[PDB]
Design an enzyme around this catalytic site. Sequence first.
Site, PDB file in Angstrom:
ATOM      1  NE  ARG A 164      -0.676   2.006 -18.231  1.00 18.50           N
ATOM      2  CZ  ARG A 164      -1.966   2.673 -17.880  1.00 18.50           C
ATOM      3  NH1 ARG A 164      -2.437   3.825 -18.010  1.00 18.50           N
ATOM      4  NH2 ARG A 164      -2.935   1.613 -17.151  1.00 18.50           N
TER       5      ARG A 164
ATOM      6  NE  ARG B 245      -6.803   6.251   0.474  1.00 21.63           N
ATOM      7  CZ  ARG B 245      -7.687   7.398   0.483  1.00 21.63           C
ATOM      8  NH1 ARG B 245      -7.778   8.434  -0.616  1.00 21.63           N
ATOM      9  NH2 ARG B 245      -8.098   7.979   1.487  1.00 21.63           N
TER      10      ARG B 245
ATOM     11  CB  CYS C 185      -6.637   4.582 -12.371  1.00 20.20           C
ATOM     12  SG  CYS C 185      -5.015   4.688 -13.019  1.00 20.20           S
TER      13      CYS C 185
ATOM     14  CE1 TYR D 109      -0.699   4.306   3.638  1.00 17.54           C
ATOM     15  CE2 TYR D 109       0.661   3.696   5.341  1.00 17.54           C
ATOM     16  CZ  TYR D 109      -0.195   3.632   4.448  1.00 17.54           C
ATOM     17  OH  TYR D 109      -1.208   2.274   4.623  1.00 17.54           O
TER      18      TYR D 109
ATOM     19  NE  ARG E 214       4.124   7.819  10.052  1.00 15.98           N
ATOM     20  CZ  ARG E 214       4.804   8.666  10.860  1.00 15.98           C
ATOM     21  NH1 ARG E 214       4.707  10.037  10.888  1.00 15.98           N
ATOM     22  NH2 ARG E 214       5.418   7.879  12.129  1.00 15.98           N
TER      23      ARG E 214
ATOM     24  NE  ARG F 234      -3.257   1.180  -0.057  1.00 13.09           N
ATOM     25  CZ  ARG F 234      -3.430   1.931   0.889  1.00 13.09           C
ATOM     26  NH1 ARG F 234      -4.306   1.472   1.973  1.00 13.09           N
ATOM     27  NH2 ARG F 234      -3.459   3.245   0.492  1.00 13.09           N
TER      28      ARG F 234
ATOM     29  CD  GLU G 121     -10.729   5.557  -1.390  1.00 10.36           C
ATOM     30  OE1 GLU G 121     -11.322   4.629  -1.542  1.00 10.36           O
ATOM     31  OE2 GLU G 121      -9.431   5.573  -0.666  1.00 10.36           O
TER      32      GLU G 121
END
Lengths: 127, 127, 127
Positions: free
Chosen positions: A63, A90, A75, A108, A116, A7, A78
């Site tokens: 890319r 993200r 993609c 992060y 965090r 992540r 969110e």
Amino acid sequence: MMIRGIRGATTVERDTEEEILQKTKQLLEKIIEENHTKPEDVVQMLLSATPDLHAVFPAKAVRELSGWQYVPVTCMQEMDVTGGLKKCIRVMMTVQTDVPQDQIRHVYLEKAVVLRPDLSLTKNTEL
Amino acid sequence: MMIRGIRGATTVERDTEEEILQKTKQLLEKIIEENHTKPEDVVQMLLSATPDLHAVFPAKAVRELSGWQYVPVTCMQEMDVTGGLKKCIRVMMTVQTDVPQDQIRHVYLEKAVVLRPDLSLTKNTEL
Amino acid sequence: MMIRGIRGATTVERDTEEEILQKTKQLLEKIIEENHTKPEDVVQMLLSATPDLHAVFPAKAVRELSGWQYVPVTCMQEMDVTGGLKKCIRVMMTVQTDVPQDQIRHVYLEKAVVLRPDLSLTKNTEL
């Protein structure tokens, strides 16, 4: 062998292509550095953006990264959470790795440092 | 051994944090009950929410589940489909497991029971 | 055995269920034929749709494809990029395969032919 999700999250000051690409690239580069990730060992990647970002697909930066031209990436929007972090990109990068789940290094950056998990909030920052 | 997706879905009656976390936790618990999933064997998780839900990221409930704090998870907005089930939370949990694909227990709770495919392996194995 | 994502995309002329299922099924069949994909080797799939598509979940075409009824799949909304391809369905198919990353065959059809790395740039010779 085993595969693991990595992540990350970052933010931009403004919805411009230069900013989205720069911060996505920097985020990916840090993930690679901390996890020692080689593009051929990446199963796939997903990048999400908050619905306030429209200038470019953040996957463009992946890319364009040298050596990453065959990494499959796509993609998504969110979810729009009331009070969620704004202008936020993200990552979910899926990698083949022997590194245990509790040693994978999630990253992060920028205003997303507040995501965090390691931190509790400082009640008095000054005294 | 192999890597497999486990699907779940549930709904809430109201766009409230307590309901979204409670139903998301209950959906994860049921998935664990039925698939015997250990958190360290989870590659990663994705949770989606229909766009009528905004109160919290459903991933919070994963991040707070005891022992699951290292499971990488992120969210996304589900498409808005005409007639699509409202107030719905979906999961895609990617796991390492030896359970065959047609024995993975996908879990549909609350009003998302209307989404279950009602497959018949008793017949599909024969004809 | 390694796990690898396969990317695809396609477009529809109309936001109808009939065209979305028709073009998603066509896309799936072409991915399957170019990559020799067997459904039990599919970890999972994701399909995204641009926010102009509402008639059906494109994942219905996967759930209805013979022998794919146990492939876990779910959908999400693609991010809304200014000048992004309209009426577009994108696929991330996660598969078990020993095929090298640079030989995976990603499939881009209909107006999404412009997403082919080898075509996306053609416009640079012209404007």
